[PDB]
Design a protein around this nucleic acid. Structure first.
Ligand SMILES: [Mg+2]
Ligand SMILES: [Mg+2]
Ligand SMILES: [Mg+2]
Ligand SMILES: [Mg+2]
Ligand SMILES: [Mg+2]
Ligand SMILES: [Zn+2]
Lengths: 102, 150, 64, 129, 206, 78
RNA sequence: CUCUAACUAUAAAAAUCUCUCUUCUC
């Protein structure tokens, strides 16, 4: 039976979208059923911020960030802990998991 | 008595392919007598033992027999060796067997001489072994020459 | 050389490892007390111990 | 400027055997190439942070002998059609490079990112494991 | 020194100046100090004791094991085999004989020799099982100072035990030899040899 | 049921005159004397280890530190 | 009744299974 009224795709009026590959297993999966995660982070972690600051010329370097949108498959997304199985009454909710920190 | 390593130093060198006779195994790894060199034990790590996944320690170790080996790190203050067995190529084991056989033939000959003369094997090596290895590069080749050319 | 250094724990970050027998702490050097590392300990520790480290660049990574 | 002789650190961290490869400003001149697999035994802990740590210490010693005192970090992932996410070792390589006296300037990420080109390896269903 | 008169005549040496509590009325707990700073507070030479034998609840809470006198912990770790498991007076006698023997060889008040041997024979970096079965290895980690004390005591007693086993020398003499050799860095000692090998193995598996 | 040790007699079951001059000569210069120490030098069987060890308490050749059974602790007389 | 910030990151191998199933009314 229908487990998802949206079918998981989130297409609703296209018929076909262009697939994208998984970052882990390289699964040719449609771009909308290709759960996306925008990893924006520091090129140097908080573990080495002090070390870099003490041992860097150009006092108060901006310490540029790194940006990458990861296109996971769905099997990896279940397994690589990105997305989790949910209650059938919890599948309703599409909001992100409540603002990890405020 | 059997002592006095064939090569230049009692302690080993860096990255020198070695030639082991295993004696016992502990939990950490195998402490193995070195027969290519004089007597000093080497440590073969468990994680660095087998090409295949480790499943049967005694099937591969074969306590009481000889095998090939490679040295990774050495200690030059009191004597300690780190050894590996996984990283041995398909062809290097052949040169290892031939070197073992020739060095063991030389060892047996000179041990026979020392046992007949009751003088420590080190002194007989002092008078015979390494000046010969300096002249020809191999004591066994020089022995064959002495068979032909005196 | 013998670069043996000491490090007094300021906090213990739970117990990690597949065995469940190792712990993870945040150590701060006897010198330069504003410079800290996270390190794995294999044994009973609490706030006050002084670990002995042969390394200083190493940082603890959760054992799985 | 107080005559800080500059180079570019130019770390390359794949998911195995990270690279630390310092060069001059031009980049046509290569010095102190020593890599991660250069210094480890397990043939697979080449990507481990300790391998990159040791490689970074060696390049720091070599370049300090050379005369270069400050370096420019150019972090590169494996790039291309692959995962192009930075390897585990390169981060520790950068930390160890900043540790050993060397001064740090203009960290950059220079990973090669494509315009969705040259179909990825693995087949349609990809690596099944 | 001021022998107190009583209807019962305690020996003079037991009456002399007894605000100077000694271990076996022979060795002074003062003059004994811990060279290493990491293992202080886990070696209990600070308190005085007249016997290396006390029925103390040193195993109720988590960390009272440190507050046990270090000589008492050595005694408790000597009594380790099925054939001799409950016998502790024998262990006290063995430790006493070891202390006099160590006093004979290089006087160096034997409590200091015990402390120095314990400091030296304890490993500073160890390993743990982390391998996920197929890729099973060892993994380098650090040791707690309390576990350093525990492990040093353990290998010292094990070395003494297998030195005494089917051997002419008594257990006290073998323990004294092990303690003397571990006071220095003499690799002939079994405990220091195990320490060195374990630290080397941990180095190999960073 | 083995034969690995291959031990010899390795012990003077009966004391001999030259061995007596020995035990007397290094009666001093052995800064610690015991049964095992005495037999370590191959010159005493082990039962006469106690015999020679007790005999040295004749003219104060060595001094007692403790005389508990199952062993003995003696230092050189100074 | 007034607000848009923090972050990572494991995939070794594991095949198969024979009976026999039995009422609910004050
Ligand atoms: Mg279904
Ligand atoms: Mg979806
Ligand atoms: Mg339409
Ligand atoms: Mg799967
Ligand atoms: Mg009984
Ligand atoms: Zn995938």
């Amino acid at each position: 039976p229908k487990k998802r009224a949206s079918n998981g795709r989130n297409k609703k009026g296209r018929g076909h979208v262009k697939p994208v590959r998984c970052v882990n297993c390289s699964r040719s999966v449609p771009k909308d059923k290709a759960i996306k995660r925008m990893a924006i982070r520091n090129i140097v972690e908080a573990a080495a911020i002090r070390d870099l600051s003490e041992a860097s010329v150009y006092a108060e370097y901006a310490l540029p960030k790194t940006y990458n949108k990861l296109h996971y498959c769905i099997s990896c997304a279940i397994h690589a802990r990105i997305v989790r199985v949910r209650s059938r009454t919890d599948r309703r909710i599409r909001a992100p998991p409540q603002r990890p920190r405020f | 008595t059997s002592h006095c390593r064939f090569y230049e130093n009692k302690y080993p060198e860096i990255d020198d392919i070695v030639m082991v006779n295993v004696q016992q195994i502990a939990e950490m790894g195998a402490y193995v007598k070195l027969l290519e060199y004089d007597n000093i034990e080497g440590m073969i790590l468990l994680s660095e033992l087998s090409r295949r996944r480790i499943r049967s320690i005694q099937k591969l170790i074969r306590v009481g027999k000889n095998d090939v080996a490679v040295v990774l790190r050495v200690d030059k203050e009191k004597g300690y060796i780190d050894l590996s067995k996984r990283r041995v190529s398909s062809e290097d084991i052949i040169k290892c067997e031939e070197k073992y056989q020739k060095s063991k033939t030389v060892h047996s000959i000179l041990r026979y001489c020392a046992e007949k003369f009751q003088i420590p094997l080190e002194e007989l090596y002092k008078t015979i072994a390494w000046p010969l290895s300096r002249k020809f590069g191999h004591a066994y080749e020089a022995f064959k020459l002495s068979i032909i050319d005196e | 050389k013998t670069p043996v250094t000491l490090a007094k724990v300021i906090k213990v970050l739970g117990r990690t490892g597949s065995r469940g027998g190792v712990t993870q702490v945040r150590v701060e050097f006897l010198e330069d007390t504003t410079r800290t590392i996270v390190r794995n300990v294999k044994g009973p520790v609490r706030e006050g111990d002084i670990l002995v480290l042969m390394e200083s660049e190493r940082e603890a990574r959760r054992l799985r | 400027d107080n005559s800080q002789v500059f180079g570019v650190a130019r770390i390359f961290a794949s998911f195995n055997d990270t690279f630390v490869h310092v060069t001059d400003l031009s980049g046509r001149e290569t010095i102190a190439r020593v890599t991660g697999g250069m210094k480890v035994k397990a043939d697979r802990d080449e990507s481990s942070p300790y391998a990159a740590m040791l490689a970074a210490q060696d390049v720091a010693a070599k370049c300090k002998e050379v005369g270069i005192t400050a370096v420019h970090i150019k972090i590169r992932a494996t790039g291309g059609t692959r995962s192009k996410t930075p390897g585990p070792g390169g981060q520790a390589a950068l930390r160890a490079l900043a540790r050993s006296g060397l001064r740090i300037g203009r960290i950059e990420d220079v990973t090669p990112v494509p315009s969705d080109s040259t179909r990825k390896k693995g087949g349609r269903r990809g690596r099944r494991l | 020194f001021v022998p107190v008169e009583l209807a019962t005549t305690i020996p003079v040496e037991i009456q002399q100046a007894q605000q100077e509590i000694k271990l076996f009325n022979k060795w002074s707990f003062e003059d004994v100090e811990v060279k290493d700073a990491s293992l202080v507070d886990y070696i209990q030479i600070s308190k005085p004791i007249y016997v290396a034998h006390t029925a103390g609840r040193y195993a109720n809470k988590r960390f009272r094991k440190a507050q046990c006198p270090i000589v008492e912990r050595l005694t408790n770790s000597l009594m380790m085999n099925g054939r001799n498991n409950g016998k502790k007076l024998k262990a006290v006698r063995i430790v006493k004989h070891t202390l006099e023997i160590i006093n004979v060889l290089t006087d160096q008040n034997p409590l200091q020799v015990v402390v120095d041997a314990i400091i030296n024979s304890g490993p500073r970096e160890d390993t743990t099982r982390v391998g996920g079965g197929g890729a099973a290895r060892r993994q380098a980690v650090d040791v707690s100072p309390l576990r350093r004390v525990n492990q040093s005591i353990a290998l010292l007693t094990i070395g003494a035990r297998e030195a005494a086993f089917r051997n002419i020398k008594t257990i006290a003499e073998t323990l004294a030899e092990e303690l003397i050799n571990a006071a220095k860095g003499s690799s002939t000692s079994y405990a220091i040899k195990k320490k060195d090998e374990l630290e080397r193995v941990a180095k190999s598996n960073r | 049921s083995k034969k690995s040790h291959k031990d010899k007699a390795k012990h003077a079951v009966v004391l001999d005159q030259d061995k007596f001059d020995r035990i007397m000569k290094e009666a001093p210069t052995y800064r610690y004397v015991s049964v095992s120490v005495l037999v370590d030098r191959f010159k005493l069987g082990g039962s006469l280890a106690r015999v020679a060890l007790r005999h040295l308490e004749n003219e104060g050749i060595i001094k007692p530190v403790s005389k508990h059974s199952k062993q003995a602790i003696y230092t050189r007389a100074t």
